[PDB]
Amino acid sequence: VTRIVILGGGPAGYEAALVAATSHPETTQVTVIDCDGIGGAAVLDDCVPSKTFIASTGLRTELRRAPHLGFHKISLPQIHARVKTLAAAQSADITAQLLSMGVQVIAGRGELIDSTPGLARHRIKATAADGSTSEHEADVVLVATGASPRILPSAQPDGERILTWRQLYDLDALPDHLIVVGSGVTGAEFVDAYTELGVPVTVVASQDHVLPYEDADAALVLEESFAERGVRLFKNARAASVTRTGAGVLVTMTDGRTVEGSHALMTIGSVPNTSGLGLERVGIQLGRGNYLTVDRVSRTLATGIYAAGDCTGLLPLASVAAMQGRIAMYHALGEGVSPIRLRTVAATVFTRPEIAAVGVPQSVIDAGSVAARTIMLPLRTNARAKMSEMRHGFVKIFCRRSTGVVIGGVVVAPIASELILPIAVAVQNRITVNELAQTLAVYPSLSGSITEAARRLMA
Amino acid sequence: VTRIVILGGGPAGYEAALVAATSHPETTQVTVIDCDGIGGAAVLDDCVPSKTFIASTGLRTELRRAPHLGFHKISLPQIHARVKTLAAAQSADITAQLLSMGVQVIAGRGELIDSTPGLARHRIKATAADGSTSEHEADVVLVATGASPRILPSAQPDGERILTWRQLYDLDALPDHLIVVGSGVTGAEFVDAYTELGVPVTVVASQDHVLPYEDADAALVLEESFAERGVRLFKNARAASVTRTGAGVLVTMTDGRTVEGSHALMTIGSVPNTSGLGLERVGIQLGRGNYLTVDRVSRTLATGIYAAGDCTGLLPLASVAAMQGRIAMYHALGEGVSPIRLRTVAATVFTRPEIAAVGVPQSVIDAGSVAARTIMLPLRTNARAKMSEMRHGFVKIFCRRSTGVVIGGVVVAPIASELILPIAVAVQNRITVNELAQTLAVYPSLSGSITEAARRLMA
Amino acid sequence: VTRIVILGGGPAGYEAALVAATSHPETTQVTVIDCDGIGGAAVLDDCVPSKTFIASTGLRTELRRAPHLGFHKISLPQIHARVKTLAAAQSADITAQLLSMGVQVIAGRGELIDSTPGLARHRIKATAADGSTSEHEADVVLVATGASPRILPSAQPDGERILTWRQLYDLDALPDHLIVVGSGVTGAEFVDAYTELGVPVTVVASQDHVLPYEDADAALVLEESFAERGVRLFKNARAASVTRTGAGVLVTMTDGRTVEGSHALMTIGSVPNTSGLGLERVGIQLGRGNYLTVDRVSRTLATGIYAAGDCTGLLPLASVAAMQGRIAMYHALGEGVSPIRLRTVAATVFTRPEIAAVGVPQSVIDAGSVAARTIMLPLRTNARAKMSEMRHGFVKIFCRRSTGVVIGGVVVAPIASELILPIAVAVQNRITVNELAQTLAVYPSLSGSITEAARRLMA
Amino acid sequence: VTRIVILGGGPAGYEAALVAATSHPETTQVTVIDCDGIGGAAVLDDCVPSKTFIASTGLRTELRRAPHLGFHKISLPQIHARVKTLAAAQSADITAQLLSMGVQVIAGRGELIDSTPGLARHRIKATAADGSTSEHEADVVLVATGASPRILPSAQPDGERILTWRQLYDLDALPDHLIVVGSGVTGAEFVDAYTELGVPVTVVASQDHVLPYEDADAALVLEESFAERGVRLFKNARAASVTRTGAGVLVTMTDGRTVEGSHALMTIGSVPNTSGLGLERVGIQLGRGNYLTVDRVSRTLATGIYAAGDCTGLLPLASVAAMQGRIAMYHALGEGVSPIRLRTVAATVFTRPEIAAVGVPQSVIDAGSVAARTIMLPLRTNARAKMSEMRHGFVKIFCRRSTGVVIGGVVVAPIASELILPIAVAVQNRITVNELAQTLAVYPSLSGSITEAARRLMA
């Protein structure tokens, strides 16, 4: 009976407990210790709440679009009910899954409490919201505590007017004029969301683009998308402060530059939740930025102790958190282990249209660092695209020059988040464009355009 | 120079020409003799249009689902106008590609006119609608004439009340009571589409279900669905005839009972367009079903002569027709060749929800004929599904017992036609559930469930 | 810096160190504490020497086969001198590599001396033959102590007449009548070697054959061979004792009958060198057979503590010992890890001819447990074989029923130990008979038969 | 019943008939028509006779080598008996194989006799040595007639003193001083063979090396080998003439340069046997040099007619002849077809030691045309090498930089012809050095050095 105690039940923590319970039923004993809610911030506060929200926003799009398709009060509070609700329901499903796999699930905060630094088998005191405490022996420990919203002391949030992304679903009415500070992917997604609801938005970006995408082609597509929809924009701006004004907020840059609005949404980074964990008791020193630096097999510098997800700093994606957790267990439980390769991550930006990519960026290729052949197929010639009235979406594919091995791709379409999977497995399993061009994809489908992109790179 | 002449311009033909002219610009001369216009019936008549029609129908589905989301006349002629219009563009895009790729398109009906029956190089005649005629030499000949609606002489279509699916978009008003004769995928799809436009439907099915379907679990999802939305069906009945009554239509079936609707949609099958082609002049004799029996490498029993598409009877899907023309060009132009394997074909029924499958059916695994592990993962626990308010979708993945190689998969969800692709890649490339499980699919998406599906199959 | 201390320097150890120091020059400090000298018994005692001895024997085989080819004193002491001499060089080459790679080699016997039993970092003590002693800290510990000859107290080896295989090269003359006790691979090999030097041999086998062997067809090839060359055997008998007579030796077996030779070679098994290591100080308790039970990832039940080689009892082949040390370094240094699969191990018996096998035995396929296709291709039709005057060699390849993936192979020929490799690659990498069949092996060679073997399995 | 008639039964012809008969038993009818003897020149005159001969030569090597290994009249005619004999026996085995597979086997010369040029089904008149004739209908035709020794009109052979490689086995006594004209692989092999028998040899090379190997390393190994064994050498020499002298031969260069000897062995090229075939009757024009130019799928410019082996000019190796034939049938019979890639050919030079290589040459890599990592492992540190007293053999391996995919290798050892297979399948099936380093090769073996070469390239 090897004991596995996991601090945090978000995706790094939960998907880890799931691999441990499933693969080793009678050999192991898995204990998740989470303070805020199974599914973590991923499910109850950030990722699932933003996507649910964005998803809801869509409707207004397809409504203003029905008359030409032959078919002749937007109440914020209920949209929000759906958000808090679906989020809670996700969390409920996951809590169930864990329980039905023998996973012990405790509500409370965790902390290493090792009597001394060189112990092989560790100890974790779990303190409940119910005041009560409980200690647990652990052969394996996985620190999976996530991150919290970084906060600028010149822009301290309220929940009223200066808001972090978690406070949004607490607003009554749509804002009169939303000011998003911070460009970057999540700042972008909200600019697009609030834009679809009819809310005036002004972005305060660092560089030139409301969102600078490593793939130029797609980035330009969203830029046009934004101008054409009224997004206002401050290029090369750093919020010096965000004070509360008479009726709204006053955002002032470091240039002297200013912009007023009814609300300010702080879309800065996040910070690893890595304090008060006891890491000291076990000899661990947080690396730069306070992340718990981990290796390719998810392990910390102390023995038997693993770390995963946002608290480790690798990549702020729940998918990468899940795999790090999944990996830390395959390693500790003696199974095959394949380190996570940053270039096999599928990442998507949920704007309209979605941008998803996996593999070697086109820049890198256009710099001779990586030889490869490339193709960009415009989705307009595709009949499914046509039925979904897609106008500037395309599929890009990048393969090695000599072998035809798929090494990246970019997709800009309404469901790029799903169309990317196929290219990801190709990159992840050295599949050739020849092999890909061979798969009999469904007609009329957007994915048949993936199949031809590759068919065209054959050589 | 090798002379390629293709009879017929739908997926089989036009995309055999595409491969021909694209990979061998200077060693070939490709001529496509098609009578109805590039894209063939798949694009101009059957496939592209029904999917268009069904996509428009979709809007209604959503729309009145506005309240759950915080929000809150049907003009058939403009839907139809969009149906012809879009069809026309899909056809124009393809013609332009063939044309700029240097393919010689000849609008007309072509036929073989060989002197004796045993020659290497063939001779084809194109007859224009102008009565005019040109003759053409052919080193390689590709018969891609497709199929046509089957017709019951006791229920001859009439364009107004007795309708084939090609005729539906000629109506200027929704039927009062639609009677659909024939259970199958294409009757299933329209019953679903019309039920969504609010039309009453009565099916006269030959089988047990409106949509008989290989995978039981999918079948049920749809059976329960038509039944709730109130679709009426007479199981195991065939229409003895379809007469025209006062203002409606009288359907009479072989058992004597009768039903009455405003219109009757004949949804039987189709017939191969293989007559009057001069296949006699070259020694071929139409096989069972009047089909131009073909190879696994797309060739007929006569040398230099290939066929592909519905006119061969392999499978009536356009995706299969395209690979058949594609593989016939590959075999005739000395390139690498891989025969089509029926169990790699991915196929979807376009209902709401969609149903797609690939590889070994669960039927077989359960009979003991194939040694495999199987899993059925509901989609409702998936956050993305929760967002698209899916409660009955699911992912089924099947795999080899020992090796874990993916051999089949079934997907029932709103975009199954897209998500099936990754599975096909796995099937067509013997990818392993382990291999699939390491792919960092995106979160949150329904495709993440596909990687969990295989993750759990790991052994 | 992570401190690696390896107890024992044979394939398990020295080649765990090699991997250690070669891939992580600056993050590690590798110390190898070995008492007999780098290369261990595999190189200095058992493996390398018998193969050397057998290779010398080979010359005689050939030589008097001079007439068929147009052509046409045995000095045991110089053969033996070549046996020690070559052994010595193999050991010197390895020491030099370890040494220049910066590995700290310490000649001595090492043991665990941990204070309490539950620590992360361990402590080892090396005792020199000088009585001297040094102590060493160990983050990672690798127990690679190998095995020693089993000894029957009623037939204690004496160096002169009662011999273990380690002692054979101490004789200055060929035995008059060699009695070999114990049927097994290592008795089989020596019976063959001595029969070739012209020595009379009488085997007291516990089993049915001198060389009991998994694959029937191979077994026979050798049974017929020993029988023709006149090897004498008492089947199913165990030696009750081995006494020393006048000038020879009296072997008495449990049934009462007796045999008389000049010498007795005890060919029983060996015993794991797992005593006096201080495994108690760390919580381990020797498993069944006094073996240091290990993982599939080479780790013991104590953290930081790994084992590999004969002392674990996985498989007594040096090739298996080396992968065990190799995989223990990979798991401890956070690299990619793939557990050893027993059915990928390739193993050969060094008789004349050689016999090598890999993967599923034909035994199993024939029982119905594994669903496979099999073929046995004699080698005599192969031109190369005709040249090396082989009349009973053959190649057996086994493959998955549906997929055609290679899952086993057996090769009986003069260099089977080399030709088995390609098959192992196929087994270990799920290569397909189709995939193998396209490899342009060389003509003429016996390996061309391997590609035909799979070619015929194609389906 | 598709009819397949093959002109020539060497490896191109025979291995083709074997694939056709085996895969299509009741669908086909296979007819080989060969004039000289099944196995063709490959078996009855060139390749198998030279290897058998070389093999025989070895003995003298290992005899002069026995005294230090502890063991204290070379009649040419019998060595030759073995040669003619084994060659005839090979031929006998193959004739049997064909017969037992339903293949019809006719002795006689073949000729196309097509009534006219555009026939789909061809005709072949077979003329017997027995004067008699016979005609055969053919749906598929495979021209596989091999090549003949090119002959210099200034150096017309005798069979006495000026000899082609086929006349050698007709000599009574070993030559007094053999003069080989022509460097290149086969000229080399004979220099090595006659050298091992004690025969003085003088080579007349074009460039600087008795044999210029694309792999410098190995070439230098043979060069040293030759100087150290007495091979005399004329650098940059072209035989102007080879006249018969008083007692022997007088070879005079174009420089004015001369050298006398007892015999002259003409090792120039060979010429395709492509005359009198009727190729005219079917419209085929021989390409340059009179080769029957074929494509990647083994087909000629006439339909239904395939060509393979030496008569086509691709590569003068029986292995490449076999695959071309094997491929021409897979293509005609509608099976999967994979064109032959010149860079997946394993070629070996049978000298002592053998040189075998497959893949990208090291030159090409050392010219940045191909990025790759490389390694050269000297075989001296290997224990099996040591037992075979190998002194300058090594294993080279070349993998892509980014993926670790094996792309070539060179082996210089006593059985390089067999050790190369494993590297060939790796190159041919994109196997990674990681995968290769994972295969548990047999210890002590030469092939374990292949496994470490790759282990060392991991990254």
Ligand SMILES: Cc1cc2nc3c(=O)[nH]c(=O)nc-3n(C[C@H](O)[C@H](O)[C@H](O)COP(=O)(O)OP(=O)(O)OC[C@H]3O[C@@H](n4cnc5c(N)ncnc54)[C@H](O)[C@@H]3O)c2cc1C
């Ligand atoms: C607005 C926004 C949108 C995003 N959208 C996406 C997206 O579309 N796709 C994607 O892949 N990623 C997305 N991300 C990123 C993704 O949310 C994170 O990568 C992922 O949440 C990190 O998961 P985790 O399991 O490491 O940590 P978390 O999910 O953040 O949770 C760790 C949990 O552990 C608990 N915890 C903390 N300290 C302790 C303690 N001492 N004891 C017990 N429990 C403790 C808490 O309850 C906490 O919820 C988004 C992020 C934001 C902010």
Ligand SMILES: Cc1cc2nc3c(=O)[nH]c(=O)nc-3n(C[C@H](O)[C@H](O)[C@H](O)COP(=O)(O)OP(=O)(O)OC[C@H]3O[C@@H](n4cnc5c(N)ncnc54)[C@H](O)[C@@H]3O)c2cc1C
């Ligand atoms: C209602 C319906 C819905 C469908 N939905 C799907 C779907 O969702 N997905 C899918 O994959 N498949 C679908 N199919 C099937 C798919 O459309 C067919 O498999 C495909 O159309 C066949 O293509 P083809 O190129 O072989 O023939 P076709 O597309 O039928 O066209 C051959 C063309 O050649 C021409 N032609 C005929 N005779 C001659 C001649 N003598 N000379 C010159 N030209 C000639 C015609 O102009 C004709 O249009 C559907 C079918 C129907 C009936």
Ligand SMILES: Cc1cc2nc3c(=O)[nH]c(=O)nc-3n(C[C@H](O)[C@H](O)[C@H](O)COP(=O)(O)OP(=O)(O)OC[C@H]3O[C@@H](n4cnc5c(N)ncnc54)[C@H](O)[C@@H]3O)c2cc1C
């Ligand atoms: C006659 C014979 C023939 C064989 N032929 C083959 C063959 O052809 N192929 C094959 O693959 N295998 C063969 N094997 C088996 C193979 O030799 C073993 O599998 C392999 O030797 C085991 O290697 P190891 O490194 O684990 O241990 P070893 O090679 O046995 O050595 C471990 C070493 O560690 C040392 N040691 C022991 N205790 C301590 C201690 N306390 N501190 C420090 N050092 C210690 C010793 O000096 C010893 O030499 C043969 C075996 C025998 C007996």
Ligand SMILES: Cc1cc2nc3c(=O)[nH]c(=O)nc-3n(C[C@H](O)[C@H](O)[C@H](O)COP(=O)(O)OP(=O)(O)OC[C@H]3O[C@@H](n4cnc5c(N)ncnc54)[C@H](O)[C@@H]3O)c2cc1C
């Ligand atoms: C000295 C020497 C050594 C070699 N060593 C090797 C080696 O080690 N490895 C290797 O791979 N290659 C080697 N080769 C090359 C190899 O021999 C050739 O690649 C191979 O023989 C070609 O085979 P093929 O089947 O195309 O032709 P062939 O084997 O040459 O035979 C064609 C046959 O067809 C017959 N034929 C000709 N015309 C007609 C007709 N009209 N009708 C009927 N039959 C006809 C003849 O009987 C003839 O034998 C060597 C060559 C030489 C000269």
